[PDB]
Design a protein around this ligand. Structure first.
Ligand SMILES: NC(=[NH2+])c1ccc2[nH]c(-c3ccccc3O)nc2c1
Ligand SMILES: [Ca+2]
Ligand code: NA
Ligand SMILES: [Zn+2]
Lengths: 36, 250, 11
């Protein structure tokens, strides 16, 4: 149940699910001092 | 959102719009956390100082939107509420401490490429991502300036600020149930949520499992994007036990 | 400035 949510939560059909990035998420991942 | 950009289609599929039936107007932002539960800020529903006390029957929840004023036929869903739960210790008298509320939808919503729930963080995710300097994203159809409104959903990414700085920017008492975000005067970046954005989500993207988690709820701020000030958000994880309780009890 | 929505959602 919560903890995460509906099991399938946080993944967007038009982005993550298709392996596509929105134009500013990289800004976020970079502030975590390299998210890969 | 001040100094934000237009969102892309399907960027924030959990973004919800609290709309009032009469007059028909945008009340607040909210987020889809399950197919039957929406999370928002309690001051959007109850704030006695200004005589605000909405009930199920005065609100509509619109999900899957992009455009602020148009009924996006075949794309958005409108749900009615079954129940509204305000946190029993929501402090409207002093600093909007525990500004959180849950709303149960009359019927479940079906997901689509435009409607999908956001995840709520667990102790480990809270710990590793809620660090000053990390950026989060806020979305809403709120004002564009302090003193106009946008045609579509706006987005802005703000860093979390160290708690000392947050306390040193206001006279208001900050509790451990709030965090603040925004840029310092000496950064050369602007941005903030603004009126009309209350209730919406502050989310972060986990670099471990690629999911978006909602760390905060837009709660308050003094003006919009003023230099020296920050925006405050309700700390979702600290209130998560209350969330779990009403969802597995109701 | 909000466009009307289907009567059925007011009730
Ligand atoms: N600057 C900000 N970070 C901010 C965020 C949400 C707000 N919500 C409001 C607000 C103002 C009047 C009535 C309701 C509100 O939620 N001001 C706000 C300011
Ligand atoms: Ca991984
Ligand atoms: Na500021
Ligand atoms: Zn899905």
């Amino acid at each position: 149940t919560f903890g995460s949510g509906e099991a399938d939560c946080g993944l967007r059909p038009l982005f993550e699910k298709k392996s596509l990035e929105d134009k500013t998420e990289r800004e976020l991942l970079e502030s975590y001092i390299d998210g890969r | 959102i001040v100094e934000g950009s237009d969102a892309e289609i399907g960027m924030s599929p959990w973004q919800v719009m609290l709309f009032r039936k009469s007059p028909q107007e945008l009340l607040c932002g909210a987020s889809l956390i399950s197919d039957r539960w929406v999370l928002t800020a309690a001051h959007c529903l109850l704030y006695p100082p200004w005589d605000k006390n909405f009930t199920e029957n005065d609100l509509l929840v619109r999900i899957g939107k992009h455009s602020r004023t148009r009924y996006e036929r075949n794309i958005e869903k409108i749900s009615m509420l079954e129940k509204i739960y305000i946190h029993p210790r929501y402090n409207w008298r002093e600093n909007l401490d525990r500004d959180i509320a849950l709303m149960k939808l009359k019927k479940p919503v079906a997901f689509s490429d435009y409607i999908h729930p956001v995840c709520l963080p667990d102790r480990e995710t809270a710990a590793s991502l809620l660090q000053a300097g990390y950026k989060g994203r806020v979305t809403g159809w709120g004002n564009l300036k302090e003193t106009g409104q946008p045609s579509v959903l706006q987005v802005v990414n703000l860093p979390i600020v160290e708690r000392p700085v947050c306390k040193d920017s206001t006279r208001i008492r900050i509790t451990d149930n709030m965090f603040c975000a925004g840029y310092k005067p000496d950064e050369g970046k602007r941005g903030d949520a603004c009126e009309g954005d209350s209730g919406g989500p502050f989310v972060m993207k986990s670099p471990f499992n690629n999911r978006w988690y909602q760390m905060g709820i837009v709660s308050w701020g003094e003006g919009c994007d003023r230099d020296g000030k920050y925006g405050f958000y309700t700390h979702v994880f600290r209130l998560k036990k209350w969330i779990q309780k009403v969802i597995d009890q109701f | 400035d909000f466009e009307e929505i289907p009567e059925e959602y007011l009730q």
